[PDB]
mmCIF file of C-alpha atoms in Angstrom:
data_model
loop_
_atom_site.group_PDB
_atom_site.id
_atom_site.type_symbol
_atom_site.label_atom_id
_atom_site.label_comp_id
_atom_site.label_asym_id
_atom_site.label_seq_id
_atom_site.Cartn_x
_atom_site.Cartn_y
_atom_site.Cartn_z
ATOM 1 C CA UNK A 1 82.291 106.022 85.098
ATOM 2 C CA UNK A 2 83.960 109.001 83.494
ATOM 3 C CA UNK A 3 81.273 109.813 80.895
ATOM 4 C CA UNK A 4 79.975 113.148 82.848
ATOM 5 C CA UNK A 5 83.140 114.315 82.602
ATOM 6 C CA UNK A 6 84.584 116.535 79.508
ATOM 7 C CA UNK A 7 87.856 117.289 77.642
ATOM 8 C CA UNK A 8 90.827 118.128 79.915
ATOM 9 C CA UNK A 9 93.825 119.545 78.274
ATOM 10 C CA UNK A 10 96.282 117.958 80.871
ATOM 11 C CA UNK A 11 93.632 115.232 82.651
ATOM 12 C CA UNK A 12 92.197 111.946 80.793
ATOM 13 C CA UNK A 13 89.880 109.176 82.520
ATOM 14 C CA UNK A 14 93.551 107.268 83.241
ATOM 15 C CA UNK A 15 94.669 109.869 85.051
ATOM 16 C CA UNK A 16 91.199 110.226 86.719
ATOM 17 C CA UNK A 17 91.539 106.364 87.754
ATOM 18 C CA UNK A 18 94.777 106.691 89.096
ATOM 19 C CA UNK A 19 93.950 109.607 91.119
ATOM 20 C CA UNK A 20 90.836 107.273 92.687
ATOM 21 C CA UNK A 21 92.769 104.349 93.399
ATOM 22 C CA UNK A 22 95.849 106.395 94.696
ATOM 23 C CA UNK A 23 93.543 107.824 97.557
ATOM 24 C CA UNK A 24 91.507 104.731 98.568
ATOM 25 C CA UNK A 25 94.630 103.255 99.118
ATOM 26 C CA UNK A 26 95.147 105.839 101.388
ATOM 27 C CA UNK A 27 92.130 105.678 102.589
ATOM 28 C CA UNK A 28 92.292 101.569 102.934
ATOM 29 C CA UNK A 29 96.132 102.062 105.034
ATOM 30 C CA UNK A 30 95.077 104.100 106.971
ATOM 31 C CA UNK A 31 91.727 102.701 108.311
ATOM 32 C CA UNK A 32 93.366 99.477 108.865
ATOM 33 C CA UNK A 33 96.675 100.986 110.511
ATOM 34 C CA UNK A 34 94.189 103.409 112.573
ATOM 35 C CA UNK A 35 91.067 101.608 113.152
ATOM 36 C CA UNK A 36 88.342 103.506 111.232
ATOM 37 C CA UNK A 37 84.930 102.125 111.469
ATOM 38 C CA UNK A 38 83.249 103.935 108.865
ATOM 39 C CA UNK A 39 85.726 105.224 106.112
ATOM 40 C CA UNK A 40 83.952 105.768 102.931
ATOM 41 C CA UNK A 41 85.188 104.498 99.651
ATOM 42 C CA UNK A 42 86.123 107.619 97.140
ATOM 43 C CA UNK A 43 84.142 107.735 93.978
ATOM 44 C CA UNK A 44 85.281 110.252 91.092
ATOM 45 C CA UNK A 45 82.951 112.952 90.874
ATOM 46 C CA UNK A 46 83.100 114.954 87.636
ATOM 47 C CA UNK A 47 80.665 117.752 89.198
ATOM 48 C CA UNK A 48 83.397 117.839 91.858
ATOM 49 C CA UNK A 49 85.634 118.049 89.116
ATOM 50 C CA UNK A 50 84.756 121.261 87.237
ATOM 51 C CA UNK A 51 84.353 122.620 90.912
ATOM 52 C CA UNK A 52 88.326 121.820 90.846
ATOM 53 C CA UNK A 53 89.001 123.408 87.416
ATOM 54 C CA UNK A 54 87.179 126.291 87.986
ATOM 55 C CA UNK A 55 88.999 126.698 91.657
ATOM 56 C CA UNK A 56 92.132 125.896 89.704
ATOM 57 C CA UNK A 57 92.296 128.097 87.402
ATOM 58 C CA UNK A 58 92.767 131.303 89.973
ATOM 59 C CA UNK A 59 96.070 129.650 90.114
ATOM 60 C CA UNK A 60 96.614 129.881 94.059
ATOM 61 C CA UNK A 61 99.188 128.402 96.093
ATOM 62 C CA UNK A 62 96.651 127.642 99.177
ATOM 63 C CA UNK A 63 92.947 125.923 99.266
ATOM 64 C CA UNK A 64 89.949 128.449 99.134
ATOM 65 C CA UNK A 65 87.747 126.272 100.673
ATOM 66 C CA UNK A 66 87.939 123.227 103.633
ATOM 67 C CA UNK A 67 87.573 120.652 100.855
ATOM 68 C CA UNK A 68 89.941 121.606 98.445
ATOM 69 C CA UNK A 69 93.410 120.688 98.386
ATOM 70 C CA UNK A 70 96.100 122.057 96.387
ATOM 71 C CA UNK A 71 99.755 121.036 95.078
ATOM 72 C CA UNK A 72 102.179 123.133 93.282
ATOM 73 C CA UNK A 73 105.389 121.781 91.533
ATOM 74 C CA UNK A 74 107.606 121.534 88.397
ATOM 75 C CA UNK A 75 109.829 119.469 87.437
ATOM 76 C CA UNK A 76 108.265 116.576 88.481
ATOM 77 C CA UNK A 77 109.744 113.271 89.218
ATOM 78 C CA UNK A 78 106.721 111.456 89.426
ATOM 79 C CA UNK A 79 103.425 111.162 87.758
ATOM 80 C CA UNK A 80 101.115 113.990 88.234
ATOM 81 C CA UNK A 81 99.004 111.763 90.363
ATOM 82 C CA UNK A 82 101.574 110.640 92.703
ATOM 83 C CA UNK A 83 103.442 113.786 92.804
ATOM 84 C CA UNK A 84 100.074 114.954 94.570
ATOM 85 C CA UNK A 85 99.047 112.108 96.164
ATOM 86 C CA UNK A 86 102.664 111.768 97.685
ATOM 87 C CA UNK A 87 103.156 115.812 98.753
ATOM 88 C CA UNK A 88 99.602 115.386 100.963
ATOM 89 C CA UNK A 89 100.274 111.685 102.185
ATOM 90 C CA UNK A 90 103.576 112.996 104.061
ATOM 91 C CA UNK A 91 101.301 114.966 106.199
ATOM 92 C CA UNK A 92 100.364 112.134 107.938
ATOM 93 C CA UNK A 93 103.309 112.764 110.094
ATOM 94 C CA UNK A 94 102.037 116.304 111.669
ATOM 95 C CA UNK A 95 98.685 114.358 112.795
ATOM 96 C CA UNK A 96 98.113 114.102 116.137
ATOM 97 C CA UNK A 97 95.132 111.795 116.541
ATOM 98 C CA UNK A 98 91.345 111.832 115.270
ATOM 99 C CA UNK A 99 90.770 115.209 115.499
ATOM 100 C CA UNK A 100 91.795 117.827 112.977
ATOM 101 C CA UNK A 101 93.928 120.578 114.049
ATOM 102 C CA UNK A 102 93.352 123.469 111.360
ATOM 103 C CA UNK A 103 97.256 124.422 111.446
ATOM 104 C CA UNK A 104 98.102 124.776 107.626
ATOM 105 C CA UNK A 105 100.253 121.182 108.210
ATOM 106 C CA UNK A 106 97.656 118.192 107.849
ATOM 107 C CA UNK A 107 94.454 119.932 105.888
ATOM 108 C CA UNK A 108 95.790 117.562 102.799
ATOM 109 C CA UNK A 109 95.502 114.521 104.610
ATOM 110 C CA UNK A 110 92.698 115.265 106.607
ATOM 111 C CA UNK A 111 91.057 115.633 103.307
ATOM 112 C CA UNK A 112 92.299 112.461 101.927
ATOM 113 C CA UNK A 113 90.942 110.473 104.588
ATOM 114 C CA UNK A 114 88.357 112.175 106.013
ATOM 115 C CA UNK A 115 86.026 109.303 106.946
ATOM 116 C CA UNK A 116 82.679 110.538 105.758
ATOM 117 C CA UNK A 117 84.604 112.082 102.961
ATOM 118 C CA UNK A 118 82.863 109.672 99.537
ATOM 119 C CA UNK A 119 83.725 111.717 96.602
ATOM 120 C CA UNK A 120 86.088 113.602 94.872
ATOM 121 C CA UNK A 121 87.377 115.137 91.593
ATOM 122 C CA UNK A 122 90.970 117.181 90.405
ATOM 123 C CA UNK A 123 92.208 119.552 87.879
ATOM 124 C CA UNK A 124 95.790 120.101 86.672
ATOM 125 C CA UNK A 125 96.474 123.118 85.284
ATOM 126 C CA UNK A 126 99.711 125.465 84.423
ATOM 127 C CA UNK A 127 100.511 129.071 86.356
ATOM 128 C CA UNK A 128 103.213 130.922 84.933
ATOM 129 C CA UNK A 129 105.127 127.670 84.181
ATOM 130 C CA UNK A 130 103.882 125.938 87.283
ATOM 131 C CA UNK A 131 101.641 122.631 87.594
ATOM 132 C CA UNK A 132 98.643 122.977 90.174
ATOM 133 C CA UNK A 133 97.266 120.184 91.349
ATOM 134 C CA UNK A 134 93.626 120.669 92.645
ATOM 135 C CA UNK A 135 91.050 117.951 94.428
ATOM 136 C CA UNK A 136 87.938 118.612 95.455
ATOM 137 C CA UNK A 137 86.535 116.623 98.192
ATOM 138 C CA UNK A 138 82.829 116.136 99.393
ATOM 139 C CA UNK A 139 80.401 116.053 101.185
ATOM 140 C CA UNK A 140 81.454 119.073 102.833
ATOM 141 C CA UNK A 141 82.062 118.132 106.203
ATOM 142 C CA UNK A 142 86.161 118.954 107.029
ATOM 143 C CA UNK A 143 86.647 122.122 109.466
ATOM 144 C CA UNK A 144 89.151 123.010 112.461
ATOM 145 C CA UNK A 145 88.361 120.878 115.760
ATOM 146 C CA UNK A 146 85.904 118.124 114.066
ATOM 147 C CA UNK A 147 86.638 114.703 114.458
ATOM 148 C CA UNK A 148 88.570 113.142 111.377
ATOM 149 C CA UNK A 149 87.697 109.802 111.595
ATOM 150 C CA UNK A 150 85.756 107.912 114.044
ATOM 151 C CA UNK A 151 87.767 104.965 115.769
ATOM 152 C CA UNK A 152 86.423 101.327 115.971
ATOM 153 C CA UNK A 153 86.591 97.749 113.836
ATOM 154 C CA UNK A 154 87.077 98.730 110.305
ATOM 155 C CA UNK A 155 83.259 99.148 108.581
ATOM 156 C CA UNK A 156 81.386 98.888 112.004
ATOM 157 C CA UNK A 157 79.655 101.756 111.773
ATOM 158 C CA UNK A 158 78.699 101.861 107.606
ATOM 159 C CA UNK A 159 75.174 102.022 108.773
ATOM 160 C CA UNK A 160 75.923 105.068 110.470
ATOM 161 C CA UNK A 161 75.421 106.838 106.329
ATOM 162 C CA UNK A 162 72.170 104.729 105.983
ATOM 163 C CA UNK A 163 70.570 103.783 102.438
ATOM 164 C CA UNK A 164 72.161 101.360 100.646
ATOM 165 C CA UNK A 165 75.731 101.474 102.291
ATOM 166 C CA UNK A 166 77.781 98.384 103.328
ATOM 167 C CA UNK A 167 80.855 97.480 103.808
ATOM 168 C CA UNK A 168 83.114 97.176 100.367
ATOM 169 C CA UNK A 169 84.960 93.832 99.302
ATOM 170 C CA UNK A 170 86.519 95.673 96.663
ATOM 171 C CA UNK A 171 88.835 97.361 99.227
ATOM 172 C CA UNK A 172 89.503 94.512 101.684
ATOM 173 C CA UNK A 173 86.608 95.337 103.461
ATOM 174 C CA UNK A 174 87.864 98.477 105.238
ATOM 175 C CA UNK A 175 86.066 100.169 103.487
ATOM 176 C CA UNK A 176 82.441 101.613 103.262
ATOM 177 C CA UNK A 177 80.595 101.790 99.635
ATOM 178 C CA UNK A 178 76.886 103.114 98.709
ATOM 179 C CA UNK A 179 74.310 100.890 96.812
ATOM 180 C CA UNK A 180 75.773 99.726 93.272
ATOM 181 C CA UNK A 181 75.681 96.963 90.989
ATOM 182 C CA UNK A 182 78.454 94.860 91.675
#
């Protein structure tokens, strides 16, 4: 459900799916290649969103904050979601277990998969002939030393967010979702 969200010049609710999907896919490998036991399923968030655009706009090359993450790039060979989504999945290969080591090499993927991590929402905008790339992630929860993800049967521990959340059959059950129709 896009219908919170407004106008973008350079974002529509395709893109905004594809940027969803693209990182709990992520989120899926990973918890079954790791053993996660309570990795959230991602939600778009447009409120998360306009925190993007207005981050975004400043046109920086780094994240201002521990759930933001940024890309920078032109000529793109890719879509603009999987030019993103590509750039912070390589990171995977400076991780060195569960716990994050704030060292300006993982703090995209440690975003991305972040297991407690249920939210997020991006904004693509143009610097001086540039494309930035900007997700923001929540709840807030990502800083130097924490544990990424907790380690154990894939949704063993959904209880551990309480109200409402089980484990998700829309993602192979790996995955953790919050009360919802369905």
């Amino acid at each position: 459900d896009y219908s919170l969200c407004q106008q973008r010049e350079k974002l529509d609710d395709d893109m905004r799916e594809m940027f969803t999907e693209l990182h709990n896919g992520y989120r899926a490998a990973f918890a079954r290649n790791y053993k996660t036991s309570k990795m959230r399923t991602m939600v778009y968030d447009c409120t998360l969103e306009e925190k993007a655009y207005k981050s975004a706009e400043k046109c920086s090359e780094e994240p201002s904050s521990e759930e933001e993450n940024v890309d920078v790039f032109s000529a793109a060979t890719l879509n603009i979601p999987l030019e993103a989504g590509n750039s912070w999945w390589s990171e995977i290969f400076e991780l060195r277990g569960k716990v994050y080591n704030k060292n300006g090499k993982t703090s995209n993927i440690a975003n991305m998969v972040w297991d407690s991590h249920d939210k997020l929402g991006c904004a693509v905008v143009d610097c001086s002939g540039k494309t930035h790339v900007v997700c923001q992630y929540g709840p807030e929860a990502k800083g130097d030393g924490k544990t990424i993800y907790e380690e154990g049967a894939p949704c063993s521990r959904c209880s551990d967010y309480g109200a409402g959340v089980t484990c998700d059959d829309d993602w192979q059950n790996l995955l953790c979702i919050g009360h919802h129709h369905h």
